[PDB]
């Protein structure tokens, strides 16, 4: 059985590095992370000093 | 990093109050709730005495 | 077996009251109405004196 | 010919009143506003003292 | 309030039995599981000796 | 000209048998049923003793 | 209150004429037909001597 | 950089001629119109003497 | 078994004639073409002297 | 690099067996078939003596 | 009230840099740009000497 | 007439470089590749030593 958690990673450098930020967080607290699906991307501008890239992923992990 | 939980709130008064019912529940058990996205709405009729409005939301919260 | 009819309700007050207007109509002419799913919302402005809220629902009813 | 502008209205009271906030703004600066389609709804929580309801609409107006 | 968890069940026999595999897992660890919505289906071929059917479901459960 | 009716069939055995339950009902009351498109699938759990599979179909029939 | 019926019109000439074929049928049997939304288009080739264009529409009519 | 404007053209003859009606309007007031994407089609019936075909397009133009 | 190929036809006259341009090409090189589904439409303007209508279709053919 | 082919399998028994019919065909003519994604399901009724279940899949295979 | 403009940025280096190209343009001519949502990505190949990455964004800005 | 092939490119560096990996493969075996549309992105984690970025594209090429 797999389960997915819906995480948004952020990076001031790229959409790829924001996806990696969400996956790193998942791997700190979950075992058996097996793949992530991008479901959305965006850029925070007003609320920040530097633009922040956001990549939202479903991060799948195998249960047991 | 943000994470989202997928909650359906209910209200016998309105779609807005059913969204608030899901967000109140999230805020009772999560810190740093930052925003909710509506993803679906519906109305329970058969199973109930009064119509019940349902508003399903992804409730985002900032991790740490 | 359930069947759905695709109805748009209208209200000069709210999206919730326009959903109720479609469901009331379904319950006047159908037995066993069991739930409704919102599929669209909009507001009539040009063609009317007051703004009219519209909420389109699939209204499900149990057949027999 | 119709044209649409993509506006997000906000309200501390309801999704209906946030849709009206976007339409009022359109009517202050456009002639011949004829109807609006809801395309998204959400609630601002972290960044505000009171929850703020948001209703994003395509606001259509007739050109000439 | 309902909450949903996003699970993928697997079966070497059918899409129905893979949906049941995700729901059985949910019922082992959650109380008040009330319904599941299929959101995707697929078949693992390369990585396995027998084809494995996968049925991904949002499994809804009533909170309290 | 074809017309479609939106029916949900149920079965305690499989998604295929729930699609057949909706089509059998259509064929009892409509002439010239020509094909069905699956548009959704789900499983009733809380409200029932046995899980019930549901397969919602647009059932197309040729008019005349 | 509006209701919609889901009809597919056919024409050996164009997608526009197949939409008109579905609307003409609706107007033969319904009062107060007010507008149609195209939801799909396709072309029958194998089963026919001439290609047949198909335009599927939700045909809305005002109830009363 | 391209920008898109969301226009609905109308024609009493065809969906193609309603798309052309939106593009002609864009070309009267914009320089460098480069392509249009159809996003919706429909037919006005109740409000008019003749059926009016509508084709909504994103009309893209190159900025500078 | 059916297979589909994803083709975009073009025409300087109509969306219907651009769909026919993709289907004619499929029938020149495939046997047993049985039907086509429209999946997108657009109009080339900048790159051409006359507007060119484009209709993208999945063209299905029966294998053997 | 993976490539996908879009195949519809058929079965007079189930949606699972129609998915297997498309995958078997892919494996007869392609090397390195690695997984399939269901994208649509339907049932042929008018044109046949027995109902025929159809399951359309993108069948992915690894290139080289 | 927020408004969105639909811009496509281009870059010969990355999807992230094409999103930044659309946002920079928005910030040259709009005040209060607050965030952008990616809605599409693609790559121009035939018409150019170097591949050009394109990232289309809705760029939101706060009105007043 | 254009045709599209559905390819997934992979890269251990970025989503942009995985899109380029699919396009390079298309250009090795097809003439007249003219543009690619991103349709999905994801990251392989479990099955690999380094994360692998995947970008799935429809790669369009002009036929003749
Ligand atoms: C992707 C992205 C989306 C956002 N959406 C909203 C919104 O709907 N309303 C709001 O007040 N702030 C918003 N802030 C947003 C920031 C980012 C970065
Ligand atoms: C929004 C809404 C949806 C529902 N959907 C179903 C359904 O598919 N099948 C069922 O047995 N009961 C259902 N009950 C439902 C109740 C509500 C309120
Ligand atoms: C939600 C909403 C949508 C509408 N859409 C159209 C349209 O496409 N064309 C038209 O002539 N009138 C329209 N009138 C519309 C009115 C409402 C209220
Ligand atoms: C609807 C809604 C959406 C938002 N989305 C985001 C987001 O993606 N990222 C962010 O930093 N802030 C966000 N803020 C948001 C606020 C609202 C109210
Ligand atoms: C449904 C299904 C989907 C999959 N998708 C991918 C994919 O995108 N990339 C990959 O390396 N492996 C994949 N493996 C997949 C296996 C299954 C069973
Ligand atoms: C598919 C499926 C969906 C359902 N959805 C809902 C829902 O939204 N709310 C509710 O009160 N009951 C629900 N009951 C549901 C039962 C089934 C079987
Ligand atoms: C638009 C269009 C779609 C069709 N789809 C199918 C299908 O899925 N399976 C089948 O046996 N015949 C089909 N026949 C089809 C014919 C037309 C015209
Ligand atoms: C495409 C089309 C859509 C329309 N939609 C609506 C609607 O939702 N409500 C309304 O009062 N009038 C409507 N009028 C409409 C007219 C056209 C032509
Ligand atoms: C439908 C249509 C779409 C197109 N899209 C693009 C695009 O995204 N970028 C570009 O450089 N040229 C484009 N050219 C396009 C031309 C047509 C006709
Ligand atoms: C899934 C399914 C879809 C079909 N769709 C169509 C259609 O649009 N028009 C037609 O003439 N025949 C059709 N035949 C169809 C048969 C099947 C089995
Ligand atoms: C993303 C992308 C899309 C495009 N689409 C089209 C199209 O549909 N037709 C055309 O003639 N040229 C096209 N050119 C395109 C170029 C790019 C870069
Ligand atoms: C994007 C991506 C998707 C995948 N999906 C699946 C899946 O559904 N099931 C499975 O067994 N393996 C999977 N492996 C996957 C790997 C990647 C990289
Ligand atoms: Cl989710
Ligand atoms: Cl419907
Ligand atoms: Cl838009
Ligand atoms: Cl495809
Ligand atoms: Mg930096
Ligand atoms: Mg987002
Ligand atoms: Mg009350
Ligand atoms: Mg729901
Ligand atoms: Mg009043
Ligand atoms: Mg509507
Ligand atoms: Mg107040
Ligand atoms: Mg929004
Ligand atoms: Mg076995
Ligand atoms: Mg999946
Ligand atoms: Mg049994
Ligand atoms: Mg359902
Ligand atoms: Mg003729
Ligand atoms: Mg169809
Ligand atoms: Mg005329
Ligand atoms: Mg429209
Ligand atoms: Mg000519
Ligand atoms: Mg296209
Ligand atoms: Mg048999
Ligand atoms: Mg199909
Ligand atoms: Mg360079
Ligand atoms: Mg694009
Ligand atoms: Mg490296
Ligand atoms: Mg994928
Ligand atoms: Na989730
Ligand atoms: Na219907
Ligand atoms: Na717009
Ligand atoms: Na394809």
Numbering used by the authors:
A (entry chain A), B (entry chain A), C (entry chain A), D (entry chain A), E (entry chain A), F (entry chain A), ...: 2 to 65
Question: What's written in the study?
Answer:
Dodecin from Halobacterium salinarum is a hollow spherical dodecameric protein, which binds oxidized flavins with high affinity, whereas flavin reduction induces the dissociation of the holoprotein. To study ET, dodecin can be reconstituted on flavin-terminated ds-DNA adsorbed on gold electrodes. If ET through DNA is possible, applying a negative potential will result in flavin reduction and subsequent release of apododecin.
Prior to adsorption of apododecin tE, a non-binding dodecin variant dA was added as a negative control to show that apododecin tE is bound specifically to the flavins.5b To minimize the ET distance between the redox-active isoalloxazine subunit of flavin and DNA, different flavin–DNA ligands comprising only the first five bases at the 5′ end (oligo 5, O5) and flavins of different lengths (CofCn) were synthesized. Dodecin was reconstituted with these ligands and X-ray structures were measured. For all the flavin–DNA ligands, electron density can be traced for the isoalloxazine moiety (and the first two CH2 groups). For the CofC2_O5 ligand further electron density indicates binding between apoprotein and linker plus the first two DNA bases.
